[PDB]
Amino acid sequence: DHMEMEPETMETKSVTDYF
Amino acid sequence: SMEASCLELALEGERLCKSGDCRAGVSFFEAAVQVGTEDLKTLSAIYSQLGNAYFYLHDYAKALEYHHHDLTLARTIGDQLGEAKASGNLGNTLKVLGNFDEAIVCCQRHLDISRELNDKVGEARALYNLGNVYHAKGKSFFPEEVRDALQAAVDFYEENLSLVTALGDRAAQGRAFGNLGNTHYLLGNFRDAVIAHEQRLLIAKEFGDKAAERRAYSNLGNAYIFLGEFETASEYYKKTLLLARQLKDRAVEAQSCYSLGNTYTLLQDYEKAIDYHLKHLAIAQELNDRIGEGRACWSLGNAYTALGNHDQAMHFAEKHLEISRE
């Protein structure tokens, strides 16, 4: 019985962060 | 200028990745790197997006390379927020690659920096990541150090749940509850696993997230098996099956049937066991799942042997020997 895990999150950046 | 073309290319990269075309988007980010730019801040965000895109394409070696460039550039320019983010990303990539010691250090840096900056959103995200790494580390092996890794995961998930409750972030609660429930399951805290997966189920329903709903039913089923509550467990696997069909997921439908087969065997209702095992056997051929086909054969051989049919037992064992060789 394999337990099913929740997805990893990742942190995100955008070139538009600096507009 | 170079800087303007670089931005134009990067924008298209981000558009394509958001639209779910990571392959096309990667090329635009790589074109943007090729053209180049003096703005190291912009470049850093392009590396980070490449890292994540390769991560989602399952090229984890490439993901690591790009997140390491981002981490380094974040230090070069003294962008503490960017350093924290790149560290979390590197830690998550190391975790998938099975490098748990370094993953812990990187994820811990994401957290420590998030606290220093009083960034509650980042802090919370880092605690979820750390829970994940300790869970994977414990599961990869209880020896005391293994129990301690799993218990630290529980603590990290609980701390996360506490902050994301203050933040009103329901999707984050969903993720934490699910992985907390799996960690409780590994520790043998089966009642606590149900409680966590029940909360996860509720949140899945609230978002209309059918696959999360299906995961939760399935995880609840597994916990009830180890609680000796086989009837309740079969009832949850019935919910996953109904959802499998709805979703037109062939593999997931096959698992539910297998799971039900095993559950009736534990109840000692051998006719139903046979029934669902056959349905699993069928779908396993269809998906080109050879491994599955053998398992069904072995399961069916054991059921027919316990039922009384000593002929079909021999036939499926006969079919089990074939598949195993093939």
From Swiss-Prot, chain A:
Span of the signal peptide: none
Protein role: Positive regulator of dendritic spine morphogenesis and density. Required for the maintenance of excitatory synaptic transmission. Binds phosphatidylinositol 4,5-bisphosphate.
Disease tied to this protein: Intellectual developmental disorder, X-linked 104: A form of intellectual disability, a disorder characterized by significantly below average general intellectual functioning associated with impairments in adaptive behavior and manifested during the developmental period. Intellectual deficiency is the only primary symptom of non-syndromic X-linked forms, while syndromic forms present with associated physical, neurological and/or psychiatric manifestations.
Subunit relationships: Interacts (via C-terminus) with DLG1, DLG2, DLG3 and DLG4/PSD95. Interacts (via N-terminus) with ARHGEF7; the interaction is mediated by the PDZ domain. Interacts with GPSM2 (via TPR repeat region).
Transmembrane segments: none
Free-text note regarding domains: The FERM domain mediates the interaction with phosphatidylinositol 4,5-bisphosphate.
Protein name (record): FERM and PDZ domain-containing protein 4
Record's subcellular location: Cell projection, Dendritic spine
Gene label: FRMPD4
Swiss-Prot record, chain B:
Keyword line: Cell cycle, Cell division, Cell membrane, Cytoplasm, Cytoskeleton, Deafness, Membrane, Mitosis, Nucleotide-binding, Phosphoprotein, Repeat, TPR repeat, Transport
Placement of TPR repeats on the sequence: 6-39, 44-77, 84-117, 124-156, 174-207, 214-247, 254-287, 294-326
Entry keyword Cell membrane: yes
Modified residues (Phosphoserine): S114, S324
GO biological process: cell division; establishment of mitotic spindle orientation; G protein-coupled receptor signaling pathway; maintenance of centrosome location; mitotic spindle organization; neurotransmitter receptor localization to postsynaptic specialization membrane; positive regulation of protein localization to cell cortex; positive regulation of spindle assembly
Compartment list: Cytoplasm; Cytoplasm, Cell cortex; Cytoplasm, Cytoskeleton, Spindle pole; Lateral cell membrane
Superkingdom of the organism of origin: Eukaryota
Effect of N262R: Abolishes interaction with INSC
Tissue/organ expression: Ubiquitously expressed.
Cellular component, GO annotation: cell cortex; cell cortex region; centrosome; cytoplasm; cytosol; lateral cell cortex; lateral plasma membrane; mitotic spindle pole
A molecular-function term among this protein's GO annotations: GDP-dissociation inhibitor activity
Region of interest (Important for interaction with NUMA1), residue spans: 4-326
Keyword ATP-binding: no
Additional detail: Dysfunction of LGN is associated with the phenotype of multiple micronuclei due to chromosomal mis-segregation and defect in cell division through mis-localization of mitotic spindle regulator protein NUMA1.
Annotated disease: Chudley-McCullough syndrome: An autosomal recessive neurologic disorder characterized by early-onset sensorineural deafness and specific brain anomalies on MRI, including hypoplasia of the corpus callosum, enlarged cysterna magna with mild focal cerebellar dysplasia, and nodular heterotopia. Some patients have hydrocephalus. Psychomotor development is normal.
Family classification: Belongs to the GPSM family.
Function: Plays an important role in mitotic spindle pole organization via its interaction with NUMA1. Required for cortical dynein-dynactin complex recruitment during metaphase. Plays a role in metaphase spindle orientation. Also plays an important role in asymmetric cell divisions. Has guanine nucleotide dissociation inhibitor (GDI) activity towards G(i) alpha proteins, such as GNAI1 and GNAI3, and thereby regulates their activity.
Protein name as annotated: G-protein-signaling modulator 2
Organism this protein belongs to: Homo sapiens
Source taxonomy: Eukaryota, Metazoa, Chordata, Craniata, Vertebrata
